[PDB]
């Protein structure tokens, strides 16, 4: 890999610089290089990895949605034929997006997840596995769509099981996992009732645990609780 000759600490340092410069593709490449050094990641380093790829894939997903919308309109009744270009370019962006997802899933499989033993790291990485299978599911249309969806479900479910056993209901990783698994239910699995039930129960159980927290932890948890509330308000 092109980062093989750079020190682990230098890659982390440059990932932080890239974040400041909003150079998220660079940030992702630096963190990929850091992961490939083979050592486990600290809490801060795990969040640098997730921030980097979340921003890269987020831009690709937004672009894919724009192009998919244009493509769908071109296939409506009365739309003038414009040739293969819209499909080709949507496919180009789709292929690049799938490549990013495959890269992240490859890092998780080689070998972040198998070495992650603490709840905070294991749940974090399994949430990421669910997230990137979900992003693959968003663009999937063929023979493997059901298997992609079930891979997302399975990763989220393992993360949920661990988080419920090993973390308090206000833990920000547990809350963000539940938020995203709820979105999976609503958008991917065609299970809006499950999505709503999970968001409500997650919110209520966190509310009841807020009294145990410091001011700073309270701020962290209530921020994500508001995102659960935002979705419940949108969906009901």
């Amino acid at each position: 890999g092109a980062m093989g000759s750079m020190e682990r600490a230098s890659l982390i340092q440059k990932a932080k610089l890239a974040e400041q410069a909003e150079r998220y593709e660079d940030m992702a490449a630096f963190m990929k290089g850091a992961v490939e050094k083979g050592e486990e990641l600290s809490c801060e380093e795990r969040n640098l990895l997730s921030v980097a790829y979340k921003n890269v894939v987020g831009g690709q997903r937004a672009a894919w949605r724009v192009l998919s919308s244009i493509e769908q309109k071109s296939n409506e009744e009365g739309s003038e034929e414009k040739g293969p270009e819209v499909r080709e370019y949507r496919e180009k962006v789709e292929t690049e997006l799938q490549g990013v997802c495959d890269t992240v899933l490859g890092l998780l499989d080689s070998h972040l997840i198998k070495e992650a033993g603490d709840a905070e790291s294991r749940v974090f990485y399994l949430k990421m596995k669910g997230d990137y299978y979900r992003y693959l599911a968003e663009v999937a249309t063929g023979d493997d769509k059901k298997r992609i969806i079930d891979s997302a479900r399975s990763a989220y479910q393992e993360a949920m099981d661990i988080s419920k056993k090993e973390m308090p209901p206000t833990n920000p990783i547990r809350l963000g996992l539940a938020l995203n698994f709820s979105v999976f239910h609503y958008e991917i699995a065609n299970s809006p009732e499950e999505a709503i039930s999970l968001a409500k129960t997650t919110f209520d159980e966190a509310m009841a645990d807020l009294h145990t927290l410091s001011e700073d932890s309270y701020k962290d948890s209530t921020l994500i609780m508001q995102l659960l509330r935002d979705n419940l308000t949108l969906w009901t």
């Binding site: 997230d131 963000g176 938020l179 995203n180 979105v183 609503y186 958008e187 994500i224 995102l227 659960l228 935002d230 979705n231 949108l234 969906w235």
Partner: peptide
């Protein structure tokens, strides 16, 4: 309307 929230 607003794009549902994920993290």
């Amino acid at each position: 309307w607003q794009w549902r929230k994920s993290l």
